[PDB]
Amino acid sequence: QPRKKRPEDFKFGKILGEGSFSTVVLARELATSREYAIKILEKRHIIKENKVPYVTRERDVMSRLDHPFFVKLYFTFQDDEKLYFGLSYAKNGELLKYIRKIGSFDETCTRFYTAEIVSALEYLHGKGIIHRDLKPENILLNEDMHIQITDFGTAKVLSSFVGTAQYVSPELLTEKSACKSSDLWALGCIIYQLVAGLPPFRAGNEYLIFQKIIKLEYDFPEKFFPKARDLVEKLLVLDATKRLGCEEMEGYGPLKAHPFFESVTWENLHQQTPPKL
Numbered sequence: 001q002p003r004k005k006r007p008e009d010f011k012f013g014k015i016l017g018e019g020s021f022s023t024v025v026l027a028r029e030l031a032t033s034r035e036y037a038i039k040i041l042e043k044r045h046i047i048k049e050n051k052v053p054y055v056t057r058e059r060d061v062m063s064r065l066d067h068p069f070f071v072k073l074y075f076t077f078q079d080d081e082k083l084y085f086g087l088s089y090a091k092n093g094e095l096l097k098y099i100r101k102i103g104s105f106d107e108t109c110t111r112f113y114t115a116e117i118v119s120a121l122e123y124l125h126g127k128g129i130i131h132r133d134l135k136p137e138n139i140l141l142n143e144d145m146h147i148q149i150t151d152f153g154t155a156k157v158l159s160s161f162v163g164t165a166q167y168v169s170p171e172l173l174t175e176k177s178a179c180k181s182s183d184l185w186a187l188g189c190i191i192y193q194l195v196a197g198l199p200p201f202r203a204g205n206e207y208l209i210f211q212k213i214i215k216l217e218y219d220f221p222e223k224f225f226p227k228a229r230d231l232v233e234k235l236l237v238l239d240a241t242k243r244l245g246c247e248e249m250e251g252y253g254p255l256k257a258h259p260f261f262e263s264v265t266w267e268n269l270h271q272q273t274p275p276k277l
């Protein structure tokens, strides 16, 4: 194993992201010219806010992930005040940037990028890990325009908290729980947003959004691709045991076999060339 890295090992540059308890900065490792997204955390603030379990959860999950559709944790170190996590640099940034940029995706891009997310969730769920806060903001795009999912402090490992309002599953609002199905609900929202250009549950504030969620109060624009629409209806189901892809629905086989994915080769998505946006 290589030595423990230190801040002097890098030339830091721009801020790539900001969270409540962290900041992600682009850094070039001097010895290699390699670029990394270094997530920087202030020890005192983490302790002060009782966030140690989250940071720990992230380091632990992101270390064990070994799949192209995920941001990778490459190393950690600290100084007197700070924790540094060396992450994959996803040069093209957030999927959200692209939804905004181009408005809404065509069927080819929707199908392709949905398939990668699905293929990612299949990997994640196979390891007994639930993201819990999946969204266009943490589904990033690398230089080659393949997805790289990040942001795992709120993940749960199978053998309390609430994600972003638009993507919160109903089980979370009605009994504090989360299952793999919760990610499949997030997926349903994300497909809707790729197609429609907006998340399906929208309102003046969080309360109102939550209220629409528990009543399943949303609907499709006219232009929505019919197969996409049908797929979204199989995901946005109040009963979590009845979402396509969950264990009670017999998993990812039936999900991947949905007619929306007719033209997908599931086997080597990462090797395929993404459709142009």
Ligand SMILES: C[C@@H]1COCCN1c1cc(-c2ccc3c(N)[nH]nc3c2)nc(N)n1
Pocket: 016, 017, 018, 019, 020, 022, 023, 024, 037, 039, 071, 087, 088, 089, 090, 091, 093, 140, 150, 151, 152
């Ligand atoms: C600060 C944000 C929001 O707040 C919660 C914690 N978040 C993150 C953010 C990133 C992140 C962001 C941009 C990136 C890029 N361009 N390449 N890699 C990146 C990794 N990675 C993790 N793990 N968590």
